[PDB]
Design a protein around this ligand. Structure first.
Ligand code: HEM
Ligand code: HEM
Ligand SMILES: [Cl-]
Ligand code: NA
Ligand code: NA
Lengths: 712, 712
């Protein structure tokens, strides 16, 4: 059947805002995963996973009698989709079991790994999510093979449909760069927000860049893609050498033997894929990547034999049985055990990307230190493996269970504990009145609280107003945050805070993080009062103030809004139309299309625009909370045309007189153009809508203020 | 951005079961449109609509100074998408304001019509839906121009995103037949469920079949497509001749002047399209269809002039100024008024499809009767306009407001009023015990109640267990209903009814409609008991029994299930795979994916399959309510393969021994294959899920039993 997407392939897609509906979720509306997990017998789950490691199934025999390597790869792939640019991908939603990730070429035969785990998932049911189980299984694999992990947190709730992620524009799996849809431009610049070199790869091509077996060139792609997954050089070397301490690759025969990926396979395959016609199709005959490399002399035991081999041999370019480029140790004895035949041994082998760790000069120094000091290697790998597998879990408050590491890590964007009584309802009312009596305007108060709260993204649960990081580098100097106006607001609020905290007893005090949000609440209540409407905006205290020393300024760079339609802000010109960037922002903020619509219409008339731009400010009572944006936008008395100067800025003129009434961007006018958004704008721009508009605006304002409040 | 649909364009689409979520809806979850409409001042709205008729806007000037013809077309097009095959389309959800219908070629310039209504929509807000307003505007247009309508019902709730409808497979607007995606095969057979001749037309091509101007061949397409929209010869003549008593077509210059349809237009067009470069692009210069026809001497007044012209002249093939085929009266005077220039008059003109009403012998007889008996024409048109505009509104219990016709019409599938006390909980316990003491099995009770209730479709709200039409022609004869088994169950239930009603005083009695549903509830209770579970199934009395004479047997044919995955039933071999037909059926039953999953797993083990097929009966305890279907389906100890005899039937064998354990269809195994359906099956197949399965099953069973219960 022909669909709207066929007819109008460039129209905005709002369906990404309406995922994860109660409709698609088999659990009751009252289901609380954290409550279920907190009663899990995690020790009993880990004993079952431990037994599983050495219980081979004939439909997918265990290499060396041990599934550990397979399950470490499974858990690394689960986590390895993560991109810092948007926070999308990662292990935190168990998306490996859905399209497209269940059928990526780099996830070949991880369908078998997930199927091995169904008996344990079935036993423990809703008390352990697939998302937690994939990571736990990787931890138990490591533990069973003598590696001490840094710890584990539960709390990744299962999802029930694919995430809407931009994985790239290529129409061919693993397409080499330089195609019609190339993800590369300039001097090998990978397009944001991608963090993989080819469609369907986790990071890089194990042969080398676009198949060129050059370890030095490969090292470039490794460093670039790992940095885009939040890993520096030490972490990257620790992870790759740590992983490739275990197990083997699978390339026993030509790739033409391997059939359809799971999403393409026949219904009889019952959710599995990559059925191989090569000899037995599994075990000693397995084909996965097409490479055939076994790194260490003890693939089922933690060792420092990866670096011993990397540095102890010279390497020769060779071909797998599948015709893939790989390396073998020159002059070596057969010292590596065979996966199935206890009478066969093999020479040491390496991937191009393994040799990167020796032939890139910066990796070489780290790899030599790890070689000489394997206790340093073990500790870096444990820390990196925790970071990898938890990077998208959000604040430490979300971490469940008895194995949570007590060490607070800089990458967690940590929030200090609150040690003192919180302000009560009367205190909140006193502070709101003091804020409004200071002379801070509605526009200043709403703009500041919006700037602080709207860094949250639900993709990796980073950002939000908790921490008061808006006062620190680098948030205080982001262009979108209007640094000089922000500095003046924060100075006034800090004087209000000092006076209130000075006057208290019993150690009661208010954080600046709370006061910035409460001040924004006062701005919204004042705007409602300006409109002739008395409303109370909800407020929940208990935010704390993080220090500069507790803030990684480099990691905070990815949270900078370079597009924020809710402030009519675009840092520069992009490929992507501004309205597409608005819907992307609404998705990160976890907003529905109705929530996005009411929030944007209200922010316009409150003065939230960066630079006090008039664009979309369709009111003659700025700083009053009215539905004026919608009533004026939908007024057929006004005709719109793109400006001569700028095709992305529109003039609204009286249709009769030609008088200039308004100007607006694409972000403003899309609400009068897109057939689904216009239907929403009509509800809010109706004569009966003033009370509904205020209520809905207050609701979505409060939602945004609370996005990072996992402490509640 | 490459999507899962791009990679796997044949995988099942579950998103059609999760549309119309609370997420996309701007109204509160408690919003009750019926209650809002009941408070509407309908008299005030109709005064506003009467005023609008002659209030010309310069951006789309009114023909003859009266918008009535444009609005009648707008309302006819709102209703005219309806198909009897699936009940999809029609006016009942206001889908003309969304993609794709807002942009169909046949809906060109109806964007202008809807925009003229925005001020009235704005003024009355949520108290009148767009869906109600489009039809009410059509009524007022007719009343304004002298035609007395049969009545009007409110209660069409607005919807907030496009309906998932198969409109055809063509990838070109208006493609003529015989293309690579032809909707025609054999002797001009239109594929079910389509009810138009070309992609983006309402019914037929006004020039003639595939543009061939043969009124006789055109009559064939008119008959077929109108029959597929529930209209017979009399209704079809009345509707076309009635409509074309008013207004005019628009083709003042070449179609090449007309730009992008609304969904393709620039953002500055603010939701309008078909902007024309021809002269002023509007009014006298309007281009809509490309035809230039005005039917009557008084296009803004009800007249008998359509049939006077049709019969009173001989017709000559000619071309509009756009190059379209149409017909001019041989030797006629210039009697037709111009829409704008009082100094111009025109010869009578007709479309090919108008001449059909004369040159098709069966239409000719009706047209002549209407010409000779104008009162018969007026009454037929009024009744057909009502039916057209209310055909998808469902039972009369949904009809709101003060203009609802009292007359009960056969096409409404009327239910008699209940005039007696209903059974209470004590009676329901007594009737269930009698049902279970009769010897009727779980399989018989569940199968009969499923057969009765599952005819419902939310597309046009036809069907369901109310009326006990399963005992009448043609439902009692449907293969899916197992006529011989059905007859035996009904005979036993009618004997229980007779004995219960015979023992009552005070006029209390139970309908067979109620007893069938209650007996099915007893079956489910007995099944739960068979599984060691104490369960009560909710039951709401108040169904009444319709007569054979209240049941149009030809209209009832389109509800016949030729595919019902819930009974593992396929009447023959279709081009669409069985699992796509299962999701289509779930959508018509208003089920979510979780609901569809739990229902199907439960029905399989209760013995609801047609013919007692073993396909999908993955239990050793049939007629016990357990999650066995899921636990056995997900057992990796079983391997599945298609049979030699039948690629659509699968054998489940022990992996280790090769012993046959089970057989299943595509409908069974899709729950083990589709990545999202398998995630749902896993929840219900987990060790902690038996009580959840039972309670979810009872909830969705009750939901299906109540689908048509608008009396509640
Ligand atoms: C440049 C980065 C990396 C590349 C190109 C890479 C490439 C590969 C390839 C091609 C395979 C063979 C797949 C097969 O045929 O079965 C593999 C296996 C594996 N990788 Fe990596 N890898 C990378 C990083 C990592 C990391 C970060 C980890 C975990 C910390 C990891 C752990 C493993 C394990 C345990 C296996 C063995 C699977 C088995 O025994 O079945 N890899 N890798
Ligand atoms: C065989 C069925 C039909 C055909 C092929 C057909 C075709 C057309 C076409 C081509 C136009 C001109 C559109 C334009 O250029 O503006 C039109 C106009 C119209 N049709 Fe029909 N029609 C049919 C049935 C109906 C029915 C059932 C109704 C209503 C009961 C109706 C009411 C109208 C009206 C009122 C207009 C005039 C619009 C105006 O004044 O702007 N038609 N029709
Ligand atoms: Cl639940
Ligand atoms: Na993420
Ligand atoms: Na419908």
């Amino acid at each position: 059947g022909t669909s709207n997407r066929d007819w109008w392939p460039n129209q905005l897609d709002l369906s990404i805002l309406h995922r994860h509906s109660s409709l698609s979720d088999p659990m009751g509306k009252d289901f609380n995963y954290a409550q279920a997990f907190e009663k899990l017998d995690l020790a009993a789950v880990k004993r079952d996973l431990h037994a599983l490691m050495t219980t081979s199934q004939d439909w997918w025999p265990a290499d060396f009698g041990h599934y550990g390597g397979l399950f470490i790869r499974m858990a690394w792939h689960s986590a390895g989709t993560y991109r810092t640019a948007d926070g999308r991908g990662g292990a935190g939603e168990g998306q490996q079991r859905f399209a497209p990730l269940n059928s990526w070429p780099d996830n070949a035969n991880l369908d078998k790994a997930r199927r091995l785990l169904w008996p344990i998932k079935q036993k423990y049911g809703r008390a352990i999510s697939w998302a937690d189980l994939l990571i736990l299984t990787g931890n138990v694999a490591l533990e069973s093979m003598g590696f001490k992990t840094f710890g584990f947190a539960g709390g990744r709730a299962d999802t029930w449909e694919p995430e809407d992620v931009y994985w790239g524009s290529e129409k061919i799996w693993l397409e080499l760069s330089g195609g019609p849809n190339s993800r590369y431009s300039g001097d090998r610049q990978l397009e944001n927000p991608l963090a993989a070199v080819q469609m369907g790869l986790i990071y890089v091509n194990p042969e080398g860049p676009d198949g060129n077996p050059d370890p030095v060139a490969a090292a470039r792609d490794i460093r670039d893609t790992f940095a885009r997954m939040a890993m520096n050089d030490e972490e990257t070397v620790a992870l790759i050498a740590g992983g490739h301490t275990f197990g083997k690759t699978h390339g026993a025969g030509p790739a033409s033997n391997v059939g359809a990926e799971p999403e393409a396979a026949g219904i009889e395959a019952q959710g599995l894929g990559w059925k191989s016609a090569y000899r037995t199709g599994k075990g000693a005959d397995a084909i996965t990547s097409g490479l055939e490399v076994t790194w260490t002399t003890t693939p089922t035991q933690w060792s420092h034999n990866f670096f011993e081999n990397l540095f102890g041999y010279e390497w020769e370019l060779t071909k797998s049985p599948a015709g893939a480029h790989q390396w073998v140790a020159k002059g070596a004895d057969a010292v590596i055990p065979d996966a199935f035949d206890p009478s066969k041994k093999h020479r040491p082998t390496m991937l191009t990307t393994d040799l990167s760790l020796r032939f890139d000069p910066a990796y070489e120094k780290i790899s030599r230190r790890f070689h000489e000091n394997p206790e340093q290697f073990a500790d870096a790998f444990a820390r990196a493996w925790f970071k990898l597998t938890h990077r998208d879990m959000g604040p430490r408050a979300r971490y469940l269970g008895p194995e949570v590491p007590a060490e607070v890590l800089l990458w967690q964007d940590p929030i200090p504990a609150v040690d003192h009584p919180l302000i009560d309802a009367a205190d909140a009312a006193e502070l709101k009145a003091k804020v409004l009596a200071s002379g801070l305007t509605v526009s200043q108060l709403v703009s500041t609280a919006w700037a602080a709260a709207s860094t949250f993204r639900g993709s990796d649960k980073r950002g939000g107003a908790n921490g008061a990081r808006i006062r620190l580098a680098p948030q205080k100097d982001w262009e979108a945050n209007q640094p000089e106006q922000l500095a003046a607001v924060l100075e006034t609020l800090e004087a209000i805070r000092t006076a209130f905290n000075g006057a208290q007893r019993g150690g009661k005090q208010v954080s600046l993080a709370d006061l910035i949000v409460l001040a924004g609440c006062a701005g919204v209540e004042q705007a409602a009062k300006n409109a002739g409407h008395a409303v109370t905006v909800p407020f929940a205290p208990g935010r704390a103030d993080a220090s500069q020393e507790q803030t990684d300024v480099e990691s905070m760079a990815v949270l900078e809004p370079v597009a924020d339609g809710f402030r009519n802000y675009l840092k520069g010109k992009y490929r992507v139309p501004a309205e597409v960037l608005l819907v992307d922002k609404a998705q990160l903020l976890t907003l529905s299309a109705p929530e996005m619509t009411v929030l944007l219409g209200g922010l316009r008339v409150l003065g939230a625009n960066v630079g006090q731009s008039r664009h979309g400010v369709f009111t003659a009572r700025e700083q009053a909370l009215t539905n004026d944006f919608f009533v004026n936008l939908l007024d057929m008395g006004t005709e719109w045309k793109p400006t001569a100067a700028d095709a992305d800025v529109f003039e609204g003129r009286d249709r009769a007189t030609g008088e200039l009434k308004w100007t607006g961007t694409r972000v403003d006018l899309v609400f009068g153009s897109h057939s689904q958004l216009r239907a929403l704008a009509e509800v809010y721009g109706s004569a009966d809508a003033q009370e509904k508009f205020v209520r809905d605006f207050v609701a979505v304002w409060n939602k945004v203020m609370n996005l990072d409040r996992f402490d509640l």
